[PDB]
Symmetry: C3
Subunit: 248 residues, 3 copies
Amino acid sequence: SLETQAFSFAEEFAWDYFSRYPSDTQDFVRRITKYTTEQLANEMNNGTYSDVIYTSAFYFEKYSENQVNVSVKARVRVYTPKAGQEQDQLQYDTNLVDYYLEVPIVFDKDMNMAVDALPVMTAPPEKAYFKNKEFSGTSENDADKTKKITDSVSQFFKAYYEQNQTQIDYFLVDGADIKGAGQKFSFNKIDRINIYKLSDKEFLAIVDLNVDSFGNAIKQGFNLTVVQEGDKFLVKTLEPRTSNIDLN
Amino acid sequence: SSLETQAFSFAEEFAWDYFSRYPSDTQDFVRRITKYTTEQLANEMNNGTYSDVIYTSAFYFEKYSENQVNVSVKARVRVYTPKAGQEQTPQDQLQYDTNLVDYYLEVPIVFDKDMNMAVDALPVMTAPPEKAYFKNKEFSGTSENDADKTKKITDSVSQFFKAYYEQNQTQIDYFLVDGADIKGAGQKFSFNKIDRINIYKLSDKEFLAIVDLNVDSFGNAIKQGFNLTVVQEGDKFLVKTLEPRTSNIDLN
Amino acid sequence: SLETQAFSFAEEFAWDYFSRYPSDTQDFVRRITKYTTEQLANEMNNGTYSDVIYTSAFYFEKYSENQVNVSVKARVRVYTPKAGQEQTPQDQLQYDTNLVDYYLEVPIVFDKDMNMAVDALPVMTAPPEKAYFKNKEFSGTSENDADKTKKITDSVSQFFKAYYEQNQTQIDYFLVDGADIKGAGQKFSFNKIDRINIYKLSDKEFLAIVDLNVDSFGNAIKQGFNLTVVQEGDKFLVKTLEPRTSNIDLN
């Protein structure tokens, strides 16, 4: 996959692009020449002092039959000289910066890659908007069933968070592939539960709950399809989301 | 593919901020997380945890609807817990232990027509990767056991590996079948020796060598295992293929 | 996607494979057993002291119906004892730091449920190799009219000042209606255009090829773009914005 490999290449390149040492600007040239020509490495260099927290490729554009542009988010520390020092003895302030760098990449017939031009500062990602949609369905109205389903779901979550797969599987429909959270959390309680009847024997439980990790509570939200079988209510599915639900 | 690739990076970026928490200024988390989600969800996700991040790695993709996906992310994190005996100590005076923790976070993502993304619900703790089963199956073939020929193949393979680890491509090429595309390891290791070699005859003048060997990097030995197809040219054996694995081999 | 998943798995594994603490060798076995058998985890262990900066999968090979090989670049620190310490107790050792990029080929097995494991010793492999390219200057016809080149230049300069410094409402004034061109987030100071060559593509449509520089935290950084610019009345509006100042493809 071209995009997959281009993303890793752009991330690697970006790591070096934002790693800069005025204590030796040729170090940048040595490192960057692994990705591009000497001429381009020199053009890209400057007097910045910076190092890297992460690089993450976020957007892909096919530009021609052998060229792509990959936009990369880099979290970086940029060190600026402290005030009143108007080189080897400079004291610095640390600036935490997120950069968005568009990386032009050429590839050959063997999928070897090079950065083929100056990278440029580009637009950050833009958040999607969504209108919340509460579940549209018929609330389960029988109090006996509601309590039974609720206790089953509660016991299931205790096992999901705290117990092994063997113990968990007793709560599940046959072949429901729901693996536990690795016995790494203490289940506190269900904070909110709403139950809907889907069909004669199937129900949706929409659940807000919290668990502890290392002494602090973490909120969680799920929906679960639950199946009535005999005296039992067994878990068929486990999904995140408590609204904007799609059961298809 | 493109949706999954971009969703992976988005979930990893989100997870980095999700697991960076500073209880002295919880608004910092809200500021950062609001880049990905609503200010309401940002506040719902916040807590009193103190943690920072080593890595985030998206490992599983689920398509949920026409415009929603779920991406599971492994985050290696440091969680700071107050040292024992500070139940009565003011928060700003606390001393901390460091806990190294791997978390597995399922991130629900919505996208619009332009493939802009947002986290559309609380992320939840999910199952870790489960190891696949495997069991070694030794290569099934005809062993080559002639003393001198075994000596000759072992010497050719030993010479090839010294080149593969230590020498330039020009030097490596002398040991290869014409046009075999086998590039060396970048001259960054000292080849020590072959520790084990088992040889099988594949056809006239073609053999499989299954090799355990070790090399040095910065004064410590690292074990390596390969299988190589070699072609007999007189006393010399030229390398046709080089692959990892010394069992569960597939020559097709 | 198998490749996408195998890439992530290989990266995670390589992170542990290059994290080694000789005062606690069992720690490596514990961590590596998350990916492979305890026997193979031990076979992979040694007395190295090392930790990890990044891991990045770069190459994928399908090996069989249940096996792949993923090559991973790992940037690592390897700590080597300073001189004179051959007989010094482990816990008193002083170290030098070696910055190293490793290229690790990771053999992975996958099952019908796409669970994965490392099924063999990983091996040191070949680093990536750069693509070579011959630079091609843009092939079109220069626009030479003084008035028109001045107007285009001034419009492009104003556009870039907004692109780097201003909000989208301001940038939109310089764009063809509908152009999908978002600004750089107001985080740079636009300095000047350093080089501009203008070409006529058709009636009232031009390509500007531009070298410029901007400031971030007190230092200048060079940028290169090509932009399609269209005449509307007496104005010139920006229609496209792409990196590259040569090897250009307008299709």
